[PDB]
Amino acid sequence: SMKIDVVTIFPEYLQPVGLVDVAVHDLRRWTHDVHSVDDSPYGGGPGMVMKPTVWGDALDEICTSETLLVVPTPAGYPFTQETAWQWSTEDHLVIACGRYEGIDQRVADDAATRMRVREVSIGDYVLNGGEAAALVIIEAVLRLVPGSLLEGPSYTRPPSWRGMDVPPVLLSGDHAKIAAWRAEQSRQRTIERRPDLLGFDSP
Amino acid sequence: SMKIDVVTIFPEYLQPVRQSLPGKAIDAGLVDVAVHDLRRWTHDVHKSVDDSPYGGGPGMVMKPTVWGDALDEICTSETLLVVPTPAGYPFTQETAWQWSTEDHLVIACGRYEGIDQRVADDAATRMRVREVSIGDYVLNGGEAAALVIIEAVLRLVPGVLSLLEGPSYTRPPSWRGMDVPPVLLSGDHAKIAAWRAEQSRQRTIERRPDLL
Ligand SMILES: Nc1cc(-c2ccc3ccn(Cc4ccccn4)c3c2)[nH]n1
Ligand SMILES: Nc1cc(-c2ccc3ccn(Cc4ccccn4)c3c2)[nH]n1
């Protein structure tokens, strides 16, 4: 059993969500001011940084000492399939979705004193916020909840379509020849598309 | 000006993007995002999108017949076809920059064990096709991958929306026993830049040693 809490300033983005309960929290519910979640960065620079004070009160109410705090960030550790397996057995996940240029560092540092904190990246691209990354994390984790190489090409009926035939080995019904072909196709694809997985230089 | 078409069996998954778009960008004709149900192009009364894999195996493969019809109607010869897949080329920031100047993007969102390979192969004979992965993890479909692709591409299109970045700080100067690093309040902007560069290198060594 697992509980996932997602904290964000845009709770509407998280709308695409027995054994698991998923709750979305608006961060602006923890502001006592009439107007603000963001302020200018110390030391200068572009954009805005999310204030630590608002995040502190939100995570104090939601998180326990057993909580694993997930902070999506482009500067984080790589979130992989290995990470997804490690997180699928967790009791409580809190995903802190940032916006603007990110969250004040002291939020992750403060939470690390009472709980386990993971700053993670889902890929080498920049998103506008952690909301999209949260949806990626949730999907990757939840499909592994109890209850190595690139995948080869997949085919289904008809056997001939638009003048393109399904590879005749798959129709033959020879399990040993099918497995040998599929392994060949997977290894040829991994060389071409992701040579790093087999231990070669990226293009 | 950019048109994005998304084809999926779950069109409700792509509600975040359409909601997150500002009205000013749509009214100026900079962006038009349209979501299409794949079951519009089904042939049978049961509205079948999937069928059993050739050569055995677990799970199901999405039908080439239904997908072929959908792409014939939506795609032109100037279309760049984006097909999210765990076995694809890596989608990076460089990939996002290249696609930000494109006129027509069609994202084909698969489910089950993926789409019949002949769909992309047929499309490759008359248009540019990109099979892409957003990371080294497996999702249930291409819908979450599409939201990632759309957000990354569109934020680089103006008005629509290397080492690792160091720690960022804001008000207050003191919070829960932690002070903002005094260098950031010194007024020595040469020293700040050098401090930020060192923090960037330290974070890169610790978190992403592959980039060095
Ligand atoms: N793998 C990832 C993670 C992210 C991500 C996660 C959370 C936030 C909150 C804000 N931004 C924007 C932003 C812009 C400039 C520098 C830092 N951050 C985020 C981006 N994108 N791609
Ligand atoms: N970087 C990526 C891409 C995907 C992705 C994209 C599209 C589909 C359509 C179906 N599945 C599930 C599935 C499971 C087992 C083998 C093949 N596919 C998808 C997964 N996940 N992570």
Author numbering:
A (entry chain B): 0 to 16, 28 to 45, 47 to 158, 177 to 232
B (entry chain A): 0 to 160, 177 to 227
Wording from the paper:
Structure-guided elaboration of the merged compound AW1 (Kd 0.11 mM, LE 0.36, IC50 0.23 mM) was performed, initially utilizing the indole nitrogen as a vector for growth. The addition of a 2-picolyl moiety successfully increased the affinity of AW1 by an order of magnitude in compound AW2 (Kd 12 μM, LE 0.30, IC50 33 μM). The methylene linker attached to the indole nitrogen of AW2 allowed the added pyridyl ring to occupy the region defined by Pro85, Glu112, Val137, Arg154 and Glu180. The affinity of AW2 was further improved by the addition of a nitrile group on the 4-position of its pyrazole ring, extending into the narrow space between residues 83PTP85 of the cover loop and 131VSI133 of the bottom loop respectively. AW3 (Kd 0.50 μM, LE 0.36, IC50 0.31 μM) was a significant improvement on AW2, with the addition of two heavy atoms affording a 25-fold decrease in Kd (12–0.50 μM), increasing the ligand efficiency to the level of the original merged compound AW1 (0.36), and a 100-fold decrease in IC50 (33 to 0.31 μM).
TrmD (tRNA-(N(1)G37) methyltransferase) is an essential tRNA modification enzyme in bacteria that prevents +1 errors in the reading frame during protein translation and represents an attractive potential target for the development of new antibiotics. TrmD belongs to a distinct class of S-adenosyl-l-methionine (SAM)-dependent methyltransferases known as the SpoU-TrmD (SPOUT) RNA methyltransferase superfamily or Class IV methyltransferases. Each non-crystallographic 2-fold symmetry-related protomer of TrmD interacts in an antiparallel manner and consists of two domains: a larger N-terminal domain spanning residues 1–161 and a smaller C-terminal helical domain (177–242) connected by a flexible inter-domain linker. The SAM binding region of TrmD is located at the base of the N-terminal domain and consists of a deep trefoil knot architecture, made of three distinct untwisted loop regions.
